[PDB]
Amino acid sequence: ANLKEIRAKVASIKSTQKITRAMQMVAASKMRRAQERMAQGRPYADNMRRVIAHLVQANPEYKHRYMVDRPVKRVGYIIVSSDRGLAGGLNINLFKKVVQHVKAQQEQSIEVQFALIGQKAVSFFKNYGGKVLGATTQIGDAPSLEQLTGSVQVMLDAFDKGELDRIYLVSNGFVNAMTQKPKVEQLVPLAPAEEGDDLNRTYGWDYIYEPEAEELLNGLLVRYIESMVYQGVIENVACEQSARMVAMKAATDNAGQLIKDLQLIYNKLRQAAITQEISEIVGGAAAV
Amino acid sequence: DLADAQAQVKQELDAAKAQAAQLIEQANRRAAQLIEEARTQAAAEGERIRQQ
Amino acid sequence: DLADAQAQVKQELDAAKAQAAQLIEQANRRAAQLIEEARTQAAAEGERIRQQ
Amino acid sequence: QTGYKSVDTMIPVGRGQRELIIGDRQTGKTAMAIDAIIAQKNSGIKCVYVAIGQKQSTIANVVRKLEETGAMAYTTVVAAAAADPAAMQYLAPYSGCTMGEYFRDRGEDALIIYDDLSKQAVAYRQISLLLRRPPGREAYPGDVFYLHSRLLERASRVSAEYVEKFTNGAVTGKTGSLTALPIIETQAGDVSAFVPTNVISITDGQIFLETSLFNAGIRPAVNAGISVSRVGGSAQTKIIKKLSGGIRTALAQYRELAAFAQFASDLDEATRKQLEHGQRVTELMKQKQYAPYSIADQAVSVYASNEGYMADVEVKKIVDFDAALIAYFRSEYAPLMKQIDETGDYNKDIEAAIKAGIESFKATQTY
Amino acid sequence: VNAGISVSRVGGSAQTKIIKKLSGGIRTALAQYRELAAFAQFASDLDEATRKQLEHGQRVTELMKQKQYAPYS
Amino acid sequence: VNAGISVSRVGGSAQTKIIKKLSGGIRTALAQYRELAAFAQFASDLDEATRKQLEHGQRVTELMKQKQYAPYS
Amino acid sequence: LDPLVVGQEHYEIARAVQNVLQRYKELKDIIAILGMDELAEEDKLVVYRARKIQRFFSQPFHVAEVFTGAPGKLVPLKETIRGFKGLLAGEYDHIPEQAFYMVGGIDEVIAKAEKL
Amino acid sequence: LDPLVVGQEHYEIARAVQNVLQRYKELKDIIAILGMDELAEEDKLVVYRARKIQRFFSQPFHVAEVFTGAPGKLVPLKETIRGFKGLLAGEYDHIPEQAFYMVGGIDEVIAKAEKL
Ligand SMILES: Nc1ncnc2c1ncn2[C@@H]1O[C@H](COP(=O)(O)OP(=O)(O)OP(=O)(O)O)[C@@H](O)[C@H]1O
Ligand SMILES: [Mg+2]
């Protein structure tokens, strides 16, 4: 029954099994790289949080529009995804979470608008419908902050007109080296970020503001939000790498099982062919 | 631009006309096969009478 | 241009109605042709049965 | 003409060729043979159908179906049923071939369909084994190849000189022919067995019918990847010969990359368009049973597919589109349809008329 | 020559002293190159250690090619 | 004991009424559980019905175990 | 099984069921090496519908109640056709697939789903 | 195909052509999935030269005399060696691939390319 075809198929499967092991090897290394890249963005955000907190606490005259909770009529979503598949069920779970959240927001009679990052999200929510405001594609592994200013700028501009009231960030969280969890967190209505700091330990000195404090506060807030978005994208990149590693290991195991099944089938067919050949030879010999 | 809107609204008239045309064609095409089988069975019963 | 608009609106509606007349008149005529053709087919088939 | 949009465009059959129909059980071989017999209503070529090793109820049903369509007025049925002795099942194809050859040697055309040559081979194996002749592979006698060869080699086309000599000057002008459609059945698509390997070597082509394609809805289940016809383009009318290139290349492209069919989301635009067109052309090849197409219908459908007039209709609705288009042409454009059917020409006038009809259909019909 | 499955049961005792001494590097280089030959296609995120092994293995593999009728003493 | 392929064509007529009416489609329960667990090895959703079936199939499987020369009643 | 004997509707339902089962049989190989999440949404929907169809062909016979215990059922043809038409139309996409197992007509499926 | 019997340039040209063709055949799945844009700067030249080589193997048959024009070519081996050495080296890399189709020596392909 053309046993050489089965032998070739088994060889090709065993070759693909080697192919996937190396892809797992590489995905682990990039997960390490993105994991240590997540750490380098911490001091910038820490310093900005400290400065903003001190400025807002020392000058409580006015409240900025990003720090006050106004009634909600429309919300927004910044959805980050990967550009290519073969990474577990990362995007599917994230999209299920955001869809459920949107359905929950629908009963409140508040409609939604989107800003998509990554090819998978673009396709999924172009087929889903909805009210898209911007799209971005081919982010890469180490995005430059310039590539991300478009979506956040569009969302913030829509917020400044009163069109939007909340803007949620939808991404994945890096729990450990093997597990990822979806997340839906608001960012524009800045939740007080440890504002209890520097009230008991605050000193009796203020800065010397070269511009008026209002403009300085606005400039600080915009950059702080952009940095939050960037370091939320980097963590999603790391989660994608971990998911791809896990998926490649699972594929290697499944190929290893396929080999063990095809070997049994091949052996059975080989014995059957030998028996048939011998039977025919003996019959032809006895008939002469 | 609302004149352009009336152009839109007439388009729907064409679509309705086309669907009505197809409905007529189908509902009266089916009668043809009705007639076909009626003549077949009439011939068949005549066949039993003539074979008797 | 406002005066031009209503004239174009009417010149679209009348053309739409003309399309309505033409295609709806074509459809049922085709249906009648199909009915006659099916009747001829049945006429051919029954006499074949009888000759057999 | 067989009447199938796939066979007549991709595996053509000429007069005098010997085309094999091979495939697993219950895939539509007998249906294809009977449709080929039915489609010959107006070509004026006599048919002969030989049934070997079939229960008499199936033979009676086939005869009744041929009588209902009026195709029995020019057909002869030779029946060697399953209860008949092995000698009759061994001799039936030859006695059918003689009745066929009567017409070949006198200027007229004939078409003979051997049903289940596998059962003739089985009957001859039973006869040979009981006579104590030595067996070969699979217990068949050594000379099964010579059994099938001297049967299939008689189907041919003879020149006017031969027929003039045979009739002593009565039929001077014309030339004879005889076409064969042997049918083989394979076990689990194993075409490396003895009898199918012998038969494939002799015939001028084959038409593979697949079970997996049959269940999936593609009926007939003709497999275009491995079906060939060595006569090729010379056995087609001018218009279908000119038009079949687009169908052939579309199926070739859709078949090269069928391994990625489920991954259309992750691909570039060119290959996605190739898939979009290949799926549509594959959907076009579906056809009902007992209803054959004249060459004009095939020409119109294939031309409408070639020039991208099907590119804007969803895949689930292509069959209805095609049927409505053919009916629309049958109604509006009878003279053009008869012009194409009668001759088969293909000029600028014909192409312009076809394109105008297709455009008017898309504009004003709404299938 | 498929070095993976080829075998000589006589082994070391069938070699001159110099070649017997020097064959170990060739054997281990072929082994290491054959173990991780899959990485040769990526050649992008290869760490420093495995890239050196690939570089040595490909070079040894290229070394073993030879023409006809030109034997080496 | 492979609950998938094992039957007793005599059926429930060969046991006392207690065991006859207690043991229902236990065998078919495990037969479906095997296939469900094999199909849902990688299921990331695990709706409550499948989760209940998989959490019951393991209970039933681990239930039927005993040692050499340990006859029950 | 041809339109001229059993009617158009029954023939179409049978062919659609066979097509769905065939496509699921073809997809069964990809979902083993790769995951279920590599497929498009239509293919996942087809997989779910095909599993439901496979379950729905099960039935308790009148003579098999000795082996299992559940009483037998006798399903008329109209109920089968109506159930499969709905199942192909997607009306029952919200019913878990365990409710299509060892039941009679389509009403028992809904009753069992509600009981769950 | 042995350098002793056919010389050294013949053998080297044949080996280079075979290597180019069997690398382009491997690039097929990558070209189909990604496209031609994301390949390296190397392996694009390979695609273009392999397509040109595949075209240049075409030949008009003298005995046909129909649809061809009775074009008996019977190119000397030296002409083919010169042509393929030039094509592999890259002197003809700027010519459209449609010129290399259905002609004989390189003079004819040059004339056809210049005419268009
Ligand atoms: N184009 C078609 N459309 C619908 N049904 C078809 C079509 N072609 C074939 N069939 C159906 O395929 C069914 C089974 O195939 P068929 O009747 O031709 O038997 P077969 O191929 O000769 O096999 P066997 O030799 O084992 O009897 C037939 O009942 C027929 O109605
Ligand atoms: Mg048959």
PDB file of N, CA, C and O in Angstrom, chain D residues 95-128:
ATOM      1  N   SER D  95     -19.713  -9.440 -27.063  1.00  0.00           N
ATOM      2  CA  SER D  95     -20.946  -9.464 -27.833  1.00  0.00           C
ATOM      3  C   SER D  95     -21.613  -8.102 -27.886  1.00  0.00           C
ATOM      4  O   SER D  95     -22.412  -7.855 -28.794  1.00  0.00           O
ATOM      5  N   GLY D  96     -21.320  -7.219 -26.938  1.00  0.00           N
ATOM      6  CA  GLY D  96     -21.784  -5.851 -27.048  1.00  0.00           C
ATOM      7  C   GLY D  96     -20.943  -5.068 -28.033  1.00  0.00           C
ATOM      8  O   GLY D  96     -21.450  -4.245 -28.805  1.00  0.00           O
ATOM      9  N   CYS D  97     -19.637  -5.331 -28.012  1.00  0.00           N
ATOM     10  CA  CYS D  97     -18.727  -4.641 -28.913  1.00  0.00           C
ATOM     11  C   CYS D  97     -19.007  -4.991 -30.365  1.00  0.00           C
ATOM     12  O   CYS D  97     -18.843  -4.143 -31.238  1.00  0.00           O
ATOM     13  N   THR D  98     -19.418  -6.228 -30.645  1.00  0.00           N
ATOM     14  CA  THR D  98     -19.779  -6.579 -32.017  1.00  0.00           C
ATOM     15  C   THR D  98     -20.998  -5.790 -32.489  1.00  0.00           C
ATOM     16  O   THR D  98     -21.013  -5.248 -33.608  1.00  0.00           O
ATOM     17  N   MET D  99     -22.032  -5.716 -31.650  1.00  0.00           N
ATOM     18  CA  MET D  99     -23.212  -4.935 -31.993  1.00  0.00           C
ATOM     19  C   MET D  99     -22.859  -3.475 -32.204  1.00  0.00           C
ATOM     20  O   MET D  99     -23.451  -2.809 -33.059  1.00  0.00           O
ATOM     21  N   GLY D 100     -21.910  -2.959 -31.432  1.00  0.00           N
ATOM     22  CA  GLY D 100     -21.424  -1.613 -31.662  1.00  0.00           C
ATOM     23  C   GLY D 100     -20.684  -1.471 -32.976  1.00  0.00           C
ATOM     24  O   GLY D 100     -20.905  -0.515 -33.724  1.00  0.00           O
ATOM     25  N   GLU D 101     -19.807  -2.432 -33.273  1.00  0.00           N
ATOM     26  CA  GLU D 101     -18.997  -2.382 -34.483  1.00  0.00           C
ATOM     27  C   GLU D 101     -19.835  -2.480 -35.742  1.00  0.00           C
ATOM     28  O   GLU D 101     -19.354  -2.106 -36.816  1.00  0.00           O
ATOM     29  N   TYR D 102     -21.052  -3.015 -35.647  1.00  0.00           N
ATOM     30  CA  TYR D 102     -21.926  -3.010 -36.818  1.00  0.00           C
ATOM     31  C   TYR D 102     -22.035  -1.610 -37.411  1.00  0.00           C
ATOM     32  O   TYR D 102     -21.980  -1.432 -38.631  1.00  0.00           O
ATOM     33  N   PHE D 103     -22.197  -0.601 -36.553  1.00  0.00           N
ATOM     34  CA  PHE D 103     -22.356   0.769 -37.027  1.00  0.00           C
ATOM     35  C   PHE D 103     -21.041   1.384 -37.484  1.00  0.00           C
ATOM     36  O   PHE D 103     -21.037   2.202 -38.407  1.00  0.00           O
ATOM     37  N   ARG D 104     -19.928   1.016 -36.850  1.00  0.00           N
ATOM     38  CA  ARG D 104     -18.643   1.620 -37.192  1.00  0.00           C
ATOM     39  C   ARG D 104     -18.237   1.289 -38.623  1.00  0.00           C
ATOM     40  O   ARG D 104     -17.708   2.143 -39.341  1.00  0.00           O
ATOM     41  N   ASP D 105     -18.480   0.054 -39.056  1.00  0.00           N
ATOM     42  CA  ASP D 105     -18.004  -0.375 -40.364  1.00  0.00           C
ATOM     43  C   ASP D 105     -18.903   0.089 -41.499  1.00  0.00           C
ATOM     44  O   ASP D 105     -18.652  -0.270 -42.652  1.00  0.00           O
ATOM     45  N   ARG D 106     -19.943   0.865 -41.209  1.00  0.00           N
ATOM     46  CA  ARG D 106     -20.869   1.323 -42.235  1.00  0.00           C
ATOM     47  C   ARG D 106     -21.072   2.830 -42.225  1.00  0.00           C
ATOM     48  O   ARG D 106     -22.107   3.307 -42.699  1.00  0.00           O
ATOM     49  N   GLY D 107     -20.120   3.589 -41.691  1.00  0.00           N
ATOM     50  CA  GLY D 107     -20.125   5.027 -41.788  1.00  0.00           C
ATOM     51  C   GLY D 107     -20.788   5.745 -40.633  1.00  0.00           C
ATOM     52  O   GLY D 107     -20.601   6.958 -40.488  1.00  0.00           O
ATOM     53  N   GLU D 108     -21.550   5.039 -39.809  1.00  0.00           N
ATOM     54  CA  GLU D 108     -22.246   5.690 -38.713  1.00  0.00           C
ATOM     55  C   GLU D 108     -21.395   5.657 -37.446  1.00  0.00           C
ATOM     56  O   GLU D 108     -20.394   4.945 -37.358  1.00  0.00           O
ATOM     57  N   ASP D 109     -21.807   6.446 -36.460  1.00  0.00           N
ATOM     58  CA  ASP D 109     -21.086   6.563 -35.202  1.00  0.00           C
ATOM     59  C   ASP D 109     -21.805   5.794 -34.103  1.00  0.00           C
ATOM     60  O   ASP D 109     -23.031   5.670 -34.108  1.00  0.00           O
ATOM     61  N   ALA D 110     -21.028   5.279 -33.153  1.00  0.00           N
ATOM     62  CA  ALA D 110     -21.573   4.498 -32.055  1.00  0.00           C
ATOM     63  C   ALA D 110     -20.832   4.838 -30.771  1.00  0.00           C
ATOM     64  O   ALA D 110     -19.744   5.413 -30.793  1.00  0.00           O
ATOM     65  N   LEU D 111     -21.442   4.472 -29.648  1.00  0.00           N
ATOM     66  CA  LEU D 111     -20.878   4.714 -28.328  1.00  0.00           C
ATOM     67  C   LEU D 111     -21.278   3.568 -27.416  1.00  0.00           C
ATOM     68  O   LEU D 111     -22.471   3.323 -27.222  1.00  0.00           O
ATOM     69  N   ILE D 112     -20.296   2.876 -26.852  1.00  0.00           N
ATOM     70  CA  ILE D 112     -20.550   1.693 -26.041  1.00  0.00           C
ATOM     71  C   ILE D 112     -19.987   1.919 -24.647  1.00  0.00           C
ATOM     72  O   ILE D 112     -18.910   2.501 -24.487  1.00  0.00           O
ATOM     73  N   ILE D 113     -20.728   1.476 -23.636  1.00  0.00           N
ATOM     74  CA  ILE D 113     -20.360   1.674 -22.241  1.00  0.00           C
ATOM     75  C   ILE D 113     -20.309   0.314 -21.562  1.00  0.00           C
ATOM     76  O   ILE D 113     -21.353  -0.301 -21.316  1.00  0.00           O
ATOM     77  N   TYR D 114     -19.106  -0.152 -21.254  1.00  0.00           N
ATOM     78  CA  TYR D 114     -18.922  -1.366 -20.473  1.00  0.00           C
ATOM     79  C   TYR D 114     -19.051  -1.006 -19.003  1.00  0.00           C
ATOM     80  O   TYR D 114     -18.333  -0.130 -18.512  1.00  0.00           O
ATOM     81  N   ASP D 115     -19.960  -1.672 -18.303  1.00  0.00           N
ATOM     82  CA  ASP D 115     -20.187  -1.400 -16.893  1.00  0.00           C
ATOM     83  C   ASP D 115     -19.469  -2.448 -16.054  1.00  0.00           C
ATOM     84  O   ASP D 115     -19.731  -3.647 -16.194  1.00  0.00           O
ATOM     85  N   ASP D 116     -18.571  -1.992 -15.182  1.00  0.00           N
ATOM     86  CA  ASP D 116     -17.871  -2.850 -14.231  1.00  0.00           C
ATOM     87  C   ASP D 116     -17.080  -3.948 -14.949  1.00  0.00           C
ATOM     88  O   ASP D 116     -17.380  -5.137 -14.856  1.00  0.00           O
ATOM     89  N   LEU D 117     -16.061  -3.507 -15.688  1.00  0.00           N
ATOM     90  CA  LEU D 117     -15.089  -4.456 -16.218  1.00  0.00           C
ATOM     91  C   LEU D 117     -14.405  -5.237 -15.106  1.00  0.00           C
ATOM     92  O   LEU D 117     -13.867  -6.319 -15.362  1.00  0.00           O
ATOM     93  N   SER D 118     -14.413  -4.710 -13.881  1.00  0.00           N
ATOM     94  CA  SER D 118     -13.893  -5.459 -12.745  1.00  0.00           C
ATOM     95  C   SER D 118     -14.642  -6.770 -12.565  1.00  0.00           C
ATOM     96  O   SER D 118     -14.035  -7.805 -12.268  1.00  0.00           O
ATOM     97  N   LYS D 119     -15.959  -6.751 -12.740  1.00  0.00           N
ATOM     98  CA  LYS D 119     -16.738  -7.975 -12.627  1.00  0.00           C
ATOM     99  C   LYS D 119     -16.484  -8.943 -13.773  1.00  0.00           C
ATOM    100  O   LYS D 119     -16.507 -10.157 -13.549  1.00  0.00           O
ATOM    101  N   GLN D 120     -16.214  -8.447 -14.981  1.00  0.00           N
ATOM    102  CA  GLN D 120     -15.771  -9.346 -16.037  1.00  0.00           C
ATOM    103  C   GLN D 120     -14.441  -9.994 -15.685  1.00  0.00           C
ATOM    104  O   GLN D 120     -14.246 -11.192 -15.918  1.00  0.00           O
ATOM    105  N   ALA D 121     -13.514  -9.216 -15.126  1.00  0.00           N
ATOM    106  CA  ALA D 121     -12.236  -9.777 -14.708  1.00  0.00           C
ATOM    107  C   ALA D 121     -12.434 -10.836 -13.632  1.00  0.00           C
ATOM    108  O   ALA D 121     -11.762 -11.870 -13.632  1.00  0.00           O
ATOM    109  N   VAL D 122     -13.352 -10.587 -12.698  1.00  0.00           N
ATOM    110  CA  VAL D 122     -13.626 -11.561 -11.643  1.00  0.00           C
ATOM    111  C   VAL D 122     -14.207 -12.843 -12.229  1.00  0.00           C
ATOM    112  O   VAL D 122     -13.824 -13.953 -11.838  1.00  0.00           O
ATOM    113  N   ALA D 123     -15.145 -12.714 -13.170  1.00  0.00           N
ATOM    114  CA  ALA D 123     -15.724 -13.896 -13.800  1.00  0.00           C
ATOM    115  C   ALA D 123     -14.663 -14.694 -14.546  1.00  0.00           C
ATOM    116  O   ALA D 123     -14.622 -15.928 -14.462  1.00  0.00           O
ATOM    117  N   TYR D 124     -13.787 -14.006 -15.278  1.00  0.00           N
ATOM    118  CA  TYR D 124     -12.727 -14.706 -15.986  1.00  0.00           C
ATOM    119  C   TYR D 124     -11.721 -15.336 -15.033  1.00  0.00           C
ATOM    120  O   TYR D 124     -11.191 -16.406 -15.337  1.00  0.00           O
ATOM    121  N   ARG D 125     -11.449 -14.701 -13.893  1.00  0.00           N
ATOM    122  CA  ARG D 125     -10.601 -15.329 -12.887  1.00  0.00           C
ATOM    123  C   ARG D 125     -11.227 -16.606 -12.354  1.00  0.00           C
ATOM    124  O   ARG D 125     -10.533 -17.614 -12.189  1.00  0.00           O
ATOM    125  N   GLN D 126     -12.531 -16.583 -12.082  1.00  0.00           N
ATOM    126  CA  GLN D 126     -13.204 -17.795 -11.631  1.00  0.00           C
ATOM    127  C   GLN D 126     -13.112 -18.890 -12.683  1.00  0.00           C
ATOM    128  O   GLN D 126     -12.870 -20.057 -12.358  1.00  0.00           O
ATOM    129  N   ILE D 127     -13.309 -18.534 -13.952  1.00  0.00           N
ATOM    130  CA  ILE D 127     -13.230 -19.533 -15.017  1.00  0.00           C
ATOM    131  C   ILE D 127     -11.823 -20.110 -15.113  1.00  0.00           C
ATOM    132  O   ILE D 127     -11.645 -21.326 -15.244  1.00  0.00           O
ATOM    133  N   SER D 128     -10.802 -19.254 -15.051  1.00  0.00           N
ATOM    134  CA  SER D 128      -9.433 -19.729 -15.230  1.00  0.00           C
ATOM    135  C   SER D 128      -8.974 -20.579 -14.053  1.00  0.00           C
ATOM    136  O   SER D 128      -8.257 -21.567 -14.241  1.00  0.00           O
TER     137      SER D 128
END
